Amino acid sequence: SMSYTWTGALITPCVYATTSRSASLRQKKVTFDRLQVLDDHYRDVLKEMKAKASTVKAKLLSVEEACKLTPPHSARSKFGYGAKDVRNLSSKAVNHIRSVWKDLLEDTETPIDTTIMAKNEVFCVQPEKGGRKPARLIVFPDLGVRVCEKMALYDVVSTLPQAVMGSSYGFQYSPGQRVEFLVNAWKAKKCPMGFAYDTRCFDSTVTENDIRVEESIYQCCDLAPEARQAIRSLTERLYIGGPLTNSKGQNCGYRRCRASGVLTTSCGNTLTCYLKAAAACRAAKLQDCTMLVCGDDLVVICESAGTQEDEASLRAFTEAMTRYSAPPGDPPKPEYDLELITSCSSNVSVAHDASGKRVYYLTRDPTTPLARAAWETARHTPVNSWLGNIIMYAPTLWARMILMTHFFSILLAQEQLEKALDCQIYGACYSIEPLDLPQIIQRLHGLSAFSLHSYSPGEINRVASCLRKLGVPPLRVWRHRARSVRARLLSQGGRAATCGKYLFNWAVRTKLKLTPIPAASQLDLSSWFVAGYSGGDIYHS
Ligand SMILES: O=C(O)/C=C/c1ccc(NC(=O)C2(NC(=O)c3ccc4c(C5CCCCC5)c5n(c4c3)CC(=O)Nc3ccccc3-5)CCCC2)cc1
Ligand SMILES: CNC(=O)c1c(-c2ccc(F)cc2)oc2cc(NS(C)(=O)=O)c(OC(C)C)cc12
């Protein structure tokens, strides 16, 4: 069946930000027929996944618990209330949510309406290898339905993926634990080989049968009878597909693939990608596989069988993935150095701590993080990706020298150091105090994140080159600015002095002794690395 059918009505509007002007180019790419052929390997992996899902007991969330996970700036309902009303448990909001819930229990078939929109995402104007990327498309149901999804499935999508996939489930790890997991898996092989597998338009490759297969996994949980019906109804009325309405309320088309803006997008994609990849590992006869899956992003670390044998096994993996309706964008390449693998735009790199010990960390090309940080400072945004970047890429040369220096200088100048910020980190939105950054960094990356030095020449060159092309002052200017920020922070005492001491020890010759931060343990990060919620409309204060 077609991933999408279109009526002809346009997807109307809500360095460079993507707009609805490029939506037709994205519609062309994501529209195609899916061919799917299943085999014994697929069926065996599925049964194994279901036997693990059978150990899960999931709870139904109350209206209040579901309302309190709603982000403050979540899209307004068409039924006369917004995210603020949901969060305050207003009578209008709650009564509409209860009626949506009852309708899910009573109506098992009627397709639920969704809104289709072009995303406004910032990318950097690079006229070199290729041109601008068209806008990504977001498909989401009404606010009342989103609250109901949380009631039925929040506990499922938060608990089931780790129970089913174990150590392969990518969202359970902090950046420090992810690097450790990867390095240990790499070291455990006699002769390691690794590859990233990039599916072309993953969301469109997800068939109606794939979505029913996901439901079959959720249905293995011990569930309240209303949760069982709500999941059943949501699968048929929303998850498998449905009508698409534009921002002007016009009938836009019909979807028969994954909706990007539903609670199950991340969980469903991870489970589907994992099922297809684990079965393809068996078809390709890959030896001693370690997989790591984050939605459609997949990496396999295995035992090498030789140069030509590895090339042949990867061709067989791709053929199996293609039969499962997951063909690649670029064909996978075998890598024999862990640093050469790029997944989720990131790679593992090497540095040394204060003692000279070799430490590993995840990095990425800083162009998009810097362009996005520049965009957000230039235009007032409710969500700020720069803080997420400082947190997730804290050990990197670029997050420390540029991002920390620049934003702490702004916060000092504005006297806003104490002000909590809403920051979108991948999936879930969090309210974070910048003065808590040293404690957060220590917990996610370890104490070594404040003492890394002796970065790789290739990493240094990528940062320096990125600064030049974007018109950003060189690293020496950042060192000078960091020394002033550091001095101003220390002079303030308290948490500000802790920021000055730990975040900017790199900027001074006479270095301070960085001991474990006292505050660190008491920090509540219990809901940080549980599960993925990208497109799932999730908020944590
Ligand atoms: O050779 C030497 O010894 C010294 C050279 C040298 C070169 C340039 C400066 N620039 C400045 O002082 C100013 N800009 C900056 O001091 C500046 C700071 C951050 C900048 C950023 C981002 C970096 C990440 C955090 C958010 C801000 C961008 N651009 C920046 C410029 C350059 C810019 O204008 N825009 C973009 C566009 C895309 C991406 C990045 C940028 C402030 C007033 C005059 C311009 C200073 C010194
Ligand atoms: C499947 N792929 C992965 O899980 C990831 C790899 C990776 C890189 C090289 C490899 F060889 C293997 C994997 O790098 C990542 C970086 C981040 N960001 S971060 C800096 O916040 O950790 C990530 O976090 C999100 C998506 C939760 C997931 C991955």
From Swiss-Prot:
Cellular location(s): Host cytoplasm; Host endoplasmic reticulum membrane
Binding-site residues for Mg(2+) 2, renumbered to this chain: D198, D296, D297
Cofactor detail note: Binds 2 magnesium ion that constitute a dinuclear catalytic metal center.
Activity regulation information from UniProt: Activity is up-regulated by PRK2/PKN2-mediated phosphorylation.
Catalyzed reactions per annotation: RNA(n) + a ribonucleoside 5'-triphosphate = RNA(n+1) + diphosphate
Essential cofactor(s): Mg(2+)
Tree of life domain: Viruses
PTM notes: The N-terminus is phosphorylated by host PRK2/PKN2.
Stretches assigned to the RdRp catalytic domain: 192-310
Membrane topology label: Single-pass type IV membrane protein
Modified residues annotated as Phosphoserine in this record: S20
Biological role stated in the UniProt entry: RNA-dependent RNA polymerase that performs primer-template recognition and RNA synthesis during viral replication. Initiates RNA transcription/replication at a flavin adenine dinucleotide (FAD), resulting in a 5'- FAD cap on viral RNAs. In this way, recognition of viral 5' RNA by host pattern recognition receptors can be bypassed, thereby evading activation of antiviral pathways.
The protein's name in its UniProt record: RNA-directed RNA polymerase
Span of the entire protein shown here: 2420 to 2982 of 3010
